[PDB]
Structure formats: structure tokens, C-alpha cells
Symmetry: C3
Subunit: 228 residues, 3 copies
């Protein structure tokens, strides 16, 4: 301790670490090349998040941003995490449905814009402008959610029932959990400052473990990850 | 205002934003997977440039570099833009001609070296050494231009007439506009300081809008982006 | 001079530069698409290392990190080099054996974790915690070495004798040289400080030139890089 939020950074570090080891063990010896893709993506996601949670816990992933007249604690390591782990999560979805390469490029690029503009917003010293970046980032998120629900209509005619079922579940998990992140950021330490950083850190920890370990448990238990 | 160059950063932000929205609308509903690739790449390019123009306009993308005895305004956000948008532009060219994967890797890697050494040159505090980085970056640019004109000779026997025609036009647009960037940098605020930053910013804005929105209008109006 | 290690940074810059030019010339005119892949990857690796050696030589790639009560010279440019060049080296191995895409993603992602946690360890101001990052990074390296020796068993039934022979040699080169890097870091300027930075710089220069130029000479002289 020293920072009240330490307990949630420690519990996030442990849960991401444990989820990593679990998926590592579970994927041992899988030979199906399609399934190997999904295990690699899905194991890397909490492994990256483990490192970035640990950097927050040890203080490396924290910086002070002046804005609003004050020195504001900003955990920038979250953006280094999400830069990699949110396109990886989208890649799992896109591979499930056999997405066209153009659609994957749109998703991963929109996601890069979402995280990079979120990071610029998190480090911006003029308070009002932080929310301009928040809005741009939210527009990119909405684009991604649009694509996830309306960009794969060529793929339904040809889509194994189990792939369609698992993709529907993971896409709903994604839309619900990812949509909460701009709200948390808006009311928390990076935005309006109406929820203290301790609670914010709690909220992102629950979202992250659910969106990474929860998501991956649903995916990796499904037969949709193997070629038929 | 406060910085004279604000007007060109604002007009660049608007033109990249407008070009983004135009390509977004134009690509709605395209189903051809090849065409979807080109729309995704070509829409992402001004979307990224919009964000980086906005960061320059709001001041986030500006830093002060000491060199030459003085505190020099350096817009570093241009390199964050180009890191992504210049390999994307090369990918559009390379996909037009069905380039081999090795050639795409050479292009994107040379381009990474060009932008990363340009960024090191832009932030280097020993004045003479800035131009060493400029020369290395220019060597990488020349390599890219060499490949664009001489690296696709296996592809001419088999190349639809419309693909060849559109590729020739976009490759000429690219060589002419991209070759102007080292010159601007050399005479401008990052180099010899013979053209003031206001005019430099103007010049890069005209080049960028032409090399991104102009380029993309030529590409996305062509039938070369659809499989035949 | 001014820093005793300058001579090894200069000799590393020259050897990476010379190796780059050699591979550039050697690959001129190769038409085989598989061979073009290997030349592009293998030429980019010392080209990137040349730029990062030069940045260390000129001082841009050096920063001072407080830890242990003192201001410690840390060459961060090594991590910017390795971020790109170590996944590229793994890609050469993986292409030799026709690795599945999931295995390539596991390798490149583990490698990203290895270099990024090595960089966090190199910049961490709390001394004991530097070694926590070192251990995590070493765990990722061990994972990569595990995959290289045990992740391609589906590929031996079908593997040209010359591909198998060249892959075995380069994999042994890789395991031996890469395993020395955590040791050097642990005893050198970033770790326990038992080997002075001058000697550390010497050691990394010999490893890097061997792991990039030595490796690439073995690869690019082999017929395993051409489709049969
Ligand atoms: C050990 C051997 O494991 C290799 C195979 C099967 O075991 O897992 C391979 C699993 C996947 C195919 C690979 C996915 C990425 C890897 C797990 C590499 C990342 C490992 C990190 C060091 C995780 C960080 C530490 C952890 C405790 C969170
Ligand atoms: C495929 C395409 C379509 C993709 C399109 C690209 C898309 C992302 C859109 C562009 C995003 C754009 C906003 C990038 C802006 C740069 C951004 C980092 C600016 C903020 O940081 C700059 C500095 C100086 O003030 O502050 C310091 C910043 C922070 C305090 C510290 C930085 C933390 C980083 C987020 C770490 C992650 C990035 C690493 C360099 C990668 C891993 C390195 C490894 C060796 C650890
Ligand atoms: C869907 C997603 C993309 C997300 C949407 C969010 C996004 C559109 C938000 C817009 C950002 C925008 C408000 C940035 C401008 C802020 C700035 C004008 C603040 C004023 O600054 C005050 C004084 C100096 O202290 O200047 C004041 C002097 C003047 C009053 C300032 C002149 C302002 C100009 C009109 C700026 C032009 C740039 C525009 C972004 C161009 C339009 C883009 C287009 C695509 C709609
Ligand atoms: C805020 C902005 C960034 C924009 C986002 C706003 C936001 C409210 C969007 C959330 C929409 C979300 C409920 C998804 C909509 C359901 C729908 C797409 C389902 C379609 O898919 C198929 C169905 C079964 O046939 O799936 C099965 C359907 C599921 C089982 C339905 C699950 C819905 C959840 C119960 C919703 C979770 C809410 C949170 C846990 C907390 C909400 C409290 C809030 C008021 C703070
Ligand atoms: C809204 C729905 O649009 C989805 C489809 C068709 O409309 O566009 C999809 C178009 C392309 C296939 C996707 C290319 C990248 C996307 C456009 C995602 C980037 C959007 C950014 C938020 C742009 C920045 C704001 C703008 C005003 C510059
Ligand atoms: C496929 C391969 C063959 C590719 C080969 C790789 C190729 C690129 C060659 C190597 C390039 C090499 C020169 C990299 C050098 C690192 C460079 C950033 C050094 C300058 O920055 C370091 C610091 C400290 O002094 O200054 C601060 C620097 C600036 C003031 C701020 C940094 C701005 C950045 C340019 C932002 C873009 C990078 C982001 C990390 C990505 C998006 C992050 C997102 C979350 C916003
Ligand atoms: C085609 C592209 C790659 C672009 C080409 C551009 C690129 C080749 C530019 C070369 C960069 C080079 C000049 C960097 C050296 C600058 C440095 C010597 C300046 C002198 O510094 C003055 C004092 C200390 O204050 O040192 C002075 C003491 C001594 C006089 C310094 C000793 C200098 C050494 C000879 C440095 C050796 C490193 C070389 C780069 C190795 C040759 C590379 C090869 C591939 C040709
Ligand atoms: C400076 C360094 C970084 C290195 C670069 C130097 C630089 C001058 C290189 C530019 C070369 C450029 C003109 C391209 C050469 C044309 C050629 C490749 C055409 C081949 O392709 C097919 C033909 C039709 O059959 O295309 C059709 C051909 C086109 C229609 C020809 C178009 C040429 C343009 C009119 C040139 C634009 C010049 C600028 C707008 C401003 C120049 C002024 C300068 C002196 C400051
Ligand atoms: C010049 C023309 O060369 C093109 C072909 C054959 O010559 O090489 C092409 C070789 C490979 C297919 C491309 C691999 C990457 C390139 C070599 C681009 C990187 C070049 C850098 C500027 C190297 C840095 C300078 C050097 C002296 C280390
Ligand atoms: C496929 C996937 C599975 C991959 C998984 C991702 C994997 C990498 C795991 C995550 C890594 C994670 C540790 C990233 C952490 C960010 C890291 C850079 C933090 C250190 O730097 C932050 C700052 C502030 O204190 O210090 C300053 C830092 C340094 C002093 C300066 C930075 C040097 C950089 C290393 C330069 C290289 C990165 C560039 C942005 C890329 C080239 C830019 C170009 C334009 C030169
Ligand atoms: C195989 C690879 C992954 C490489 C392995 C290396 C890696 C596992 C190293 C572990 C890092 C770990 C030691 C980080 C914790 C350091 C920290 C507790 C130091 C103590 O700090 C002292 C005071 C405050 O000044 O706090 C002291 C007060 C308390 C005593 C601190 C409470 C400590 C908590 C138990 C921290 C929990 C987080 C864990 C990492 C969760 C377990 C992960 C799981 C996957 C095993
Ligand atoms: C430290 C940690 C990060 C973990 C790593 C520890 C480390 C010691 C690991 C090194 C293992 C290494 C020797 C590889 C093992 C050989 C084996 C895999 C060979 C299998 O492949 C096929 C065989 C022929 O049939 O290849 C041919 C086999 C080769 C020809 C054998 C070559 C072995 C070398 C002679 C070893 C080089 C040692 C160094 C140059 C210096 C060692 C001194 C040390 C004590 C400081
Ligand atoms: C593994 C962590 C996950 C899935 C994180 C998702 C993060 C987002 C969807 C972030 C979105 C944001 C906005 C839309 C607005 C600006 C603030 C952000 C970056 C939190
Ligand atoms: C969208 C913006 C585009 C197409 C930008 C292109 C930028 C270049 C070709 C930059 C080249 C440079 C050099 C060759 C030397 C050093 C200075 C640079 C980075 C401006
Ligand atoms: C071209 C340079 C090469 C092949 C470099 C390889 C570097 C490594 C294998 C680095 C490994 C490290 C650790 C395992 C622990 C932390 C310290 C590092 C980054 C040096």
C-alpha cells in the first residue's frame, strides 16, 4: 500500500497472472492450427495485462498530469495494455467469423485510434480538451461496435452453428463490457473526477478481468475454435 | 490562434476530417473483399491524420527541442501520424499490384526506418547530427521509391490494364509528393531554419492532404480496387 | 569519445551498416518469392540495428535512470532495436519451418513481452523491482526457446532436409546467443553493476553482430530460403 487503489492493482495482477497460466496449460498440446490461433491470441491478452497491472502496482505505470489546477494521478500503463490487447480481442472475434481482411484492418485500425486518442486525452493538460479526445475515441468505439454487429453479413450464409453461437455470445460480452470503459473514464480520475481513483481502479479491474479472462474462458471452452 | 501556424493546423484538421467522412460514406456497403481492403486502408489514413492534426492544433503534438542555442518548436505528432499512414499508403500500392510478401515487408520496414530516423533527427539536440538522421531517412525513402519503380517486374505480365493504369498514376503521385517532404524538413523548422514554421506548416498541410485525400480520391474512384 | 564505451558503439554501428549493405547487395535481383521474404526480413534486422547503434553512439539513445542512490547510464535504444529485430529473427525461423500462424503469434507476442518488460526493468527507479521485470522477461524468453524446440513437431514429417538442417543450425545459434543477453543485463549496468558499462557494451555488440549478421550470413547462404 500507500495508494488506496493498490489492492485492486494487486488483485488485477494476480487474476491476470492466474488466467494466463490457466490458458497456457489448457492450450498445451493442442494441434489444430485454428485452435492454436485462438489459444495464442487469448493467452497473450491476459499475459500483457498481467505485465501492465504489475507496472501500475509497482508505480512505473503511473504519471502525474497537471490539469484542472492540480497534479492528477494518471495510470498510463492501461493504454499500453489496451493498445495490444483490444486489437487481439477483436482478432479473436474476427477469426471466429472468417472476417474479410479489409474488415479486420478496419477493426484493428479503429481500435488503434480509440486507444491512442484515449491516451492523448488522458495526458492532455487543458481540461476541456480532454473530453474532445474522449469523444473522438468514443466515436471510434462506436464504429467498432457497428462493424461487429453489421459488418459480417456475408458470413452468415456460411458459418457453422457453433461458430455463430459462440461469436454471438462473445460479441454481446464485448459490447456490454467495452461500452462501460468510456463511462468509467468520463466520471473517474481522467475525466470529471466524480468517482475517486480508488473506485475507478476497482471498476476497470472488474471490467478488464471479465473482458479478458471471462471472455477467454467462454471462447476456449467452445468447439468453435477447432476446424471441423 | 497564438501560434501563427494555427490556421494551417485547423484547415488540415478539417480537410482530413472531411476526407475521412467522405471515404467512410463512399465505402458503405461495398461487399467486394478486395475493395473492402482498399477502403479500409484508405479511410484509416486521413482518420489517423485528422487525430494528429488535431493534436498539433491543440498543442499536445508540439514539443520544444533545444538545439542551435535555442528552444525550437517541433511538431512530433507528424511522426506518430506518418508511422502508421505512410506504410498504409504503401500497402495500397502494393495490394494494387499483388506484390509478393517479401516486397511488402521491405517497403513497410524501410518506411519504419524512414519515419523513425526522421523522428530521431527531429528531436536531436546536437544540431549537426540532425542532418545525419535526415540523410539516413532520405536513403530509406530513396530505397522505397526504387522498389516502387523497379520491384514489381514479375507482376507486369499479369496485371489488369486498369490496375496497371491506376498503380502508375498513384505511384507518380507518391514519388512527387513524398520527395518534397525531406526538402521541406531540410529548409524548415527542424532543419536549416530558412523557411519559418508558419510556412513549413502550410507546406506539409498541402502535401499531406494531397498525399492522403487526393491519393485516396484517385484510388477509390478506380475500378482497379475490385476483383474482376 | 567521452564515454569509454564509444568504441564498441562505433564498431557496432559500422558492422551493422556493412552487414546491411552486404545483404542488400546479395539480395538484389532474387526473384523467388520465398527467398525474397527471407532477404527482406534478414536485411531489415541489421538496418534497424545500425540506426539504433548510431543513436547510442551519438548519445540520443542514452538516458540517466536514478536507482540505487545514483544516476545510471541506460541505453534505452537497445529496446527500440530489439522490439523490431527480435520478432523479425523469430519470423525467419518460423518461415523456415512453415510454422502455423498461431505459433508465429505466440512467438512474436512472447517476444514483445520479453522486450517490453526488459525495457520497463531498465527504466525502473526502485532497484529491487528491476529484477522482478528481469525475471518476467526471462520467463518469456524461456517460453520462446521452448516453442523453438518443441512447437514445430507437426512440421518434421514434411520438412525438406535442407530446411531442417538450416533451421537446426539457426535455432542453436539463437538459443545460445539469446540466452546470454539476460546474463549480461543481470551483471551489467542495468542490473547488479558487477561488469562496467564499457565491457557490457562490448558484450552486447559481439552478441548483436553475431545474432544478426552472423545469423543472416548462415541463413542467406542456404538453399533452404528458396522454394524447391
Ligand atoms: C512452458 C511451455 O508452454 C508452451 C505451450 C504449452 O505449455 O503454451 C503456449 C501458449 C500460447 C500458444 C502462447 C501465448 C503467449 C505465451 C503465453 C507467452 C506469454 C507468457 C508471459 C511471460 C506471461 C506473463 C507471465 C504470467 C504469469 C502472466
Ligand atoms: C493499423 C493502424 C490503422 C493503427 C492506427 C494508429 C492509431 C493508434 C491512431 C494514432 C494514435 C495517436 C494518438 C498516437 C499518439 C502518440 C501518443 C503516445 C502521444 C502520447 O505520448 C507522447 C508523450 C509526450 O508528450 O507523453 C508520454 C506518453 C505516456 C506517458 C507513455 C507512453 C505509454 C505507451 C502507450 C506505451 C505503449 C507504446 C509502446 C511504444 C509500445 C511497446 C514498447 C515496449 C518496448 C515496452
Ligand atoms: C465523431 C468523432 C470525430 C468525435 C467528434 C468530436 C470532435 C469533432 C470534437 C471537435 C474538436 C474541436 C472542438 C477542437 C477545437 C477546440 C478549439 C477551437 C477551442 C477554442 O480555443 C479557445 C481560443 C484559444 O485559447 O481559441 C478560439 C478561437 C476559435 C473560436 C477557434 C476556431 C475553431 C475551428 C473551427 C477549428 C476547426 C477544426 C475542426 C475540427 C474542423 C471540422 C472537422 C470536421 C470533420 C467536422
Ligand atoms: C455508454 C456508451 C459507451 C454506449 C453503450 C451504451 C450501452 C447501454 C450499450 C449496452 C447494450 C447491451 C445490453 C447489448 C444489447 C443486447 C443485444 C445486442 C443482444 C443481441 O444478441 C443476441 C442476444 C440473444 O438473442 O444476446 C443476449 C443479450 C444479453 C444477454 C443482454 C445482456 C445485457 C446486460 C445485462 C447489460 C449489462 C449492463 C451492466 C452490467 C451495468 C448497467 C448499469 C448502468 C445503468 C450503469
Ligand atoms: C458508421 C458506420 O460506418 C461503417 C462503414 C460504412 O458506413 O464504414 C467503414 C469504413 C472503413 C472500412 C473503416 C476504416 C477506418 C474507420 C473509418 C475507423 C476510423 C474512424 C475514426 C474515428 C476517424 C476519426 C474521426 C473523423 C471525423 C476524421
Ligand atoms: C517492420 C519493421 C522493419 C519496422 C522497423 C522499425 C523502424 C521504425 C526503425 C526503428 C526506428 C527507431 C528510430 C525507433 C527510435 C525510438 C524513437 C521514438 C526515439 C524518440 O523518442 C524517445 C524519447 C526519449 O528521448 O523522446 C520522445 C519522443 C517524442 C517526443 C514522442 C513520441 C511520439 C511517437 C512517434 C508516437 C508514435 C508511437 C506510439 C508509441 C504508437 C501509438 C501509441 C498510442 C497509444 C497513442
Ligand atoms: C545511405 C544512408 C545510410 C545515409 C548515409 C548517412 C550516414 C552514413 C551518415 C554517417 C553518420 C556519421 C557521420 C556519424 C559520426 C559522427 C561523429 C563521428 C561526429 C564527430 O564527433 C566529434 C568528436 C566528439 O564531440 O568526435 C570525433 C572523433 C572521431 C573523428 C569520431 C570517429 C568517427 C567514426 C569513423 C564513426 C564510425 C561509425 C560509422 C557510421 C561506420 C561506417 C558505416 C558504414 C556502413 C559506411
Ligand atoms: C528531392 C529528393 C527527395 C529526391 C526527389 C527529387 C524530385 C525532383 C523527384 C520528382 C520526380 C517526379 C517528377 C516523377 C518523375 C516522372 C516519371 C517517374 C513518370 C513515369 O510514370 C509514367 C508517366 C506517364 O507515361 O507518368 C506521368 C508523369 C507525371 C505527370 C509528371 C509529374 C511531375 C510533376 C509536375 C513534378 C511536381 C514538382 C512539384 C509540384 C514542385 C517542383 C518545384 C521544385 C523545383 C521546388
Ligand atoms: C538500392 C536498390 O536496392 C534494392 C534491392 C536490391 O538492390 O534491395 C532490397 C533489400 C531488401 C529486400 C529490403 C530490406 C530493407 C531495406 C534494406 C531498407 C532498409 C535500408 C536502410 C536505410 C538501412 C540503413 C542504412 C545502412 C547503411 C545500415
Ligand atoms: C503482438 C503482441 C502479443 C505484443 C504484446 C505487447 C508486448 C510488447 C508487451 C507489452 C509491453 C509493455 C511493457 C509496454 C510498456 C511501455 C514502455 C515503453 C514503458 C516505458 O516507457 C514509458 C516512459 C515513461 O515513464 O519512459 C520512456 C521510455 C524510453 C526511455 C524511451 C522509449 C523507447 C522505445 C522502446 C522506442 C520504441 C517504440 C517506438 C514508439 C516505436 C518506433 C517509433 C518511431 C517513430 C521511432
Ligand atoms: C514466470 C514469470 C511470470 C516471471 C516470474 C516473476 C514474478 C512472478 C515476480 C513477482 C512480482 C512481485 C514480487 C511484485 C510484488 C512486489 C511488492 C509486494 C514488494 C513489496 O513492497 C514493500 C511495501 C511497500 O514499499 O509493500 C509490502 C506489502 C505487501 C507484503 C505486498 C503484497 C504483495 C502481494 C502478494 C502482491 C500480489 C500480486 C501477485 C503478482 C499475484 C500473484 C501472481 C500469480 C500469477 C502467481
Ligand atoms: C542462462 C539462461 C538465459 C538460460 C540459458 C542457459 C544456457 C547455458 C543455454 C545454452 C544451451 C546451448 C549450448 C544449446 C544446447 C545444444 C543443443 C540444443 C543442440 C541441439 O541441436 C542439434 C545439435 C547437433 O546434433 O546442434 C549443435 C549443438 C551446438 C554446436 C552446441 C553449441 C554450444 C555452445 C558451444 C555454447 C556457447 C557458450 C558461450 C559461447 C559461452 C559460455 C560460457 C559461460 C559459462 C559464461
Ligand atoms: C482488456 C481491456 C479492454 C477490453 C478495454 C477496453 C477499453 C475501451 C473500450 C476503451 C475506451 C475508451 C473510450 C471509448 C473513450 C476514451 C476513454 C477510453 C480509452 C477508456
Ligand atoms: C501522409 C503523409 C505522408 C505521405 C508523408 C510522407 C513523409 C515522408 C516521405 C518523410 C520523409 C522524410 C525524410 C526522407 C527525411 C527526414 C525528414 C522526413 C521524415 C520528413
Ligand atoms: C538483435 C539482438 C538480439 C537477438 C537480442 C536479444 C535480446 C534478448 C534475448 C533479451 C533478453 C532479456 C532478458 C531475457 C531479461 C531482461 C533483459 C533482456 C531484455 C536483455
Amino acid at each position: 500500500t500507500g495508494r488506496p487503489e493498490w489492492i485492486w492493482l494487486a488483485l488485477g495482477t494476480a487474476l491476470m497472472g492466474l488466467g494466463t497460466l490457466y490458458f497456457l496449460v489448457k492450450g498445451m498440446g493442442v494441434s489444430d492450427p485454428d485452435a492454436k490461433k485462438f489459444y495464442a491470441i487469448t493467452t497473450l491478452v491476459p499475459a500483457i495485462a498481467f505485465t501492465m497491472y504489475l507496472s501500475m502496482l509497482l508505480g512505473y505505470g503511473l504519471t502525474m498530469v497537471p490539469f484542472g489546477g492540480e497534479q492528477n494521478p494518471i495510470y498510463w500503463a492501461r493504454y499500453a495494455d489496451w493498445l495490444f490487447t483490444t486489437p487481439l480481442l477483436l482478432l479473436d472475434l474476427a477469426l471466429l467469423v472468417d472476417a474479410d481482411q479489409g474488415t479486420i484492418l478496419a477493426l484493428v485500425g479503429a481500435d488503434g485510434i480509440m486507444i491512442g486518442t484515449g491516451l492523448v486525452g488522458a495526458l492532455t493538460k487543458v481540461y476541456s480538451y480532454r473530453f474532445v479526445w474522449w469523444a473522438i475515441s468514443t466515436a471510434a468505439m462506436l464504429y467498432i461496435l457497428y462493424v461487429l454487429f453489421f459488418g459480417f453479413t456475408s458470413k452468415a450464409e456460411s458459418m457453422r452453428p457453433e461458430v455463430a453461437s459462440t461469436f454471438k455470445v462473445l460479441r454481446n460480452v464485448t459490447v456490454v463490457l467495452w461500452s462501460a470503459y468510456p463511462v468509467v473514464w468520463l466520471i473517474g480520475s481522467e475525466g470529471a473526477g466524480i468517482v475517486p481513483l480508488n473506485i475507478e481502479t476497482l471498476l476497470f479491474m472488474v471490467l478488464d478481468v471479465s473482458a479478458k479472462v471471462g471472455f477467454g474462458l467462454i471462447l476456449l471452452r467452445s468447439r468453435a475454435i477447432f476446424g471441423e
